[PDB]
Amino acid sequence: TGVSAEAGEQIFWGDGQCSTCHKIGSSGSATRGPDQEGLAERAEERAKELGLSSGLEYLVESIIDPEKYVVEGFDKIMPRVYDPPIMLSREKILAVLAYLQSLGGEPDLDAIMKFKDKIPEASKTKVKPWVPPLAVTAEEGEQVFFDESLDVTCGKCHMVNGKGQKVGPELTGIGAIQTPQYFVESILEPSAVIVKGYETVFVITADGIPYNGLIKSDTEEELTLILEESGSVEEVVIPKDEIEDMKKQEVSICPGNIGELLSVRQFYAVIEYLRSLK
Ligand code: HEC
Ligand code: HEC
Ligand SMILES: [Ca+2]
Ligand SMILES: [Ca+2]
Ligand SMILES: [Ca+2]
C-alpha cells in the first residue's frame, strides 16, 4: 500500500491495531491510550520538552520505544508493534507515521523516509519464540479460564466472544495485540499496569461508610461499584447524593494472588489461551 498518509490511515484502523487503544476525537471508541486528535501539534511540544529534533522524531520514538516516555495518566501498555504478535512491517510503520503527521500537521514523506533505518525490521525480530516449559494447549487454558471450581476464575470478570462476566476489560482479540510477557505480568503483577478506566475508586458516604472498588456505571443519580474480595465480587449501588468523597487509586481488582492459586500448568495453559485470542 506504500508510504502515504492514506495508507497509514488504513493501517491505524486496520492491522496496525492502533485503534484498539487509540481514538481520534469522535472517531473510534477506544480509551486504553491517549486520544490522538491534534497529535501532530502535541508531538512538537513533547519534542521540545524532551530535547528531540522534531515532533516527527517523537512520533518515531513513541512507536519504536513505547516505554521510553510514558504520557502522563497512562501506564506501560503499548506494545512494540514491530515485534510479535503484530509484526508490523517497516513500510507499514512509515505509512502510519505519515498518517499521524496528518493529525493536525502536514505529512513530510521525505522526512519520514529518512527514519527508515531507525525502525526495527519485524522479520528480524530479536524476540525468542514463546515456549512454555510444559506441554499445554489453548483449549486447556480455555477450560481453566472459565473453571468456576478453581480458587480464581478469569471468566468471572473477563468476557471472551460472549462468554464470561463483564467486570474487567473484554479480552476478545487480545492475543493479536499483546505479548505473552504482558500476559504474565498482567496475571502475576496485576496492579503494575492498569487498563485506563479500570482504576479502583475509594468512596466515602455521608454516613461515613467506605466502599472501594471499580466503577461499573456512573449516571446522574447512582454510582454502581464492583467490590472485590478473595477473587469474589459484589455490586453496590450508591446514591450519588450520599457520596462525600471519592479518590481514584492506581490499584486493580484483577486478583493479586493468582500466582498462589494456579498451578504451574494452569498458569501456562491460560497464557496459551490468551495468545490464541486473535
Ligand atoms: C494498547 C495496547 C495500544 C496500542 C495497540 C497502541 N497504542 Fe499507542 N499508546 C498507548 C498508550 C497507553 C500510550 C500512552 C503511554 C505511552 O507509551 O506514552 C500510547 C502512546 C502513544 C503515542 C504518544 C501519544 C502522545 O500523546 O504523546 C503515540 C504517537 C502512539 N501511542 C502511537 C501508536 C500507534 C501508531 C499505534 C499503532 C501502530 C499504537 N500507538 C498502538 C496504547 C496503545
Ligand atoms: C475480577 C476480580 C477479575 C478477575 C477474576 C480477573 N481479572 Fe484480569 N482484570 C480485571 C480488571 C479490573 C482489569 C483492568 C485493570 C488492570 O489490572 O489492568 C484486568 C486486566 C487484565 C488484563 C489486561 C487486559 C488488557 O486489556 O490489557 C489481563 C491480560 C487479565 N486481566 C488477565 C486475567 C486472567 C488471566 C485472569 C484469570 C487468571 C483474570 N484476569 C481474572 C479484573 C479481573
Ligand atoms: Ca510512550
Ligand atoms: Ca493489570
Ligand atoms: Ca460484602
Numbering used by the authors: 39 to 316
List sentences from the manuscript.
Kustd1711 is a putative electron transfer protein encoded on the nitrite oxidoreductase (nxr) gene cluster of anaerobic ammonium-oxidizing (anammox) bacteria and consists of two heme-containing domains and one additional domain. Here, we describe a diheme cytochrome c with high heme redox potentials of about +350 mV, despite having a large overall negative charge, which typically reduces redox potentials. High-resolution crystal structures, spectroelectrochemical measurements, and high-end computational methods show how this is achieved: each heme iron has a calcium cation positioned next to it at a distance of only 6.9 Å, raising their redox potentials by several hundred millivolts through electrostatic interaction. We suggest that this has evolved to provide the protein with a high redox potential despite its large negative surface charge, which it likely requires for interactions with redox partners.
To improve our confidence in the assignment of the various transitions, we mutated the distal methionine ligands in both the N- and C-terminal heme sites to histidine and cysteine. To confirm that the sites can accommodate these mutations while maintaining six-coordinate heme binding and calcium binding, we determined the crystal structures of the C-terminal domain methionine mutants M292H and M292C to 1.12 and 1.70 Å resolution, respectively using the same crystallization conditions as for the wt protein, that is, including 200 mM Ca2+. This showed that these mutants are able to support both six-coordinate heme ligation as well as calcium binding, although in the M292H mutant, the plane of the distal His292’s side chain is at an angle of ∼75° with the plane of the heme porphyrin system rather than perpendicular to it. The M→C mutants did not show clearly defined transitions at low potentials and showed considerable hysteresis, which precluded meaningful fitting. That the crystal structures of the mutant showed a fully occupied calcium site in both domains is probably because of the high (200 mM) calcium concentration used in crystallization.
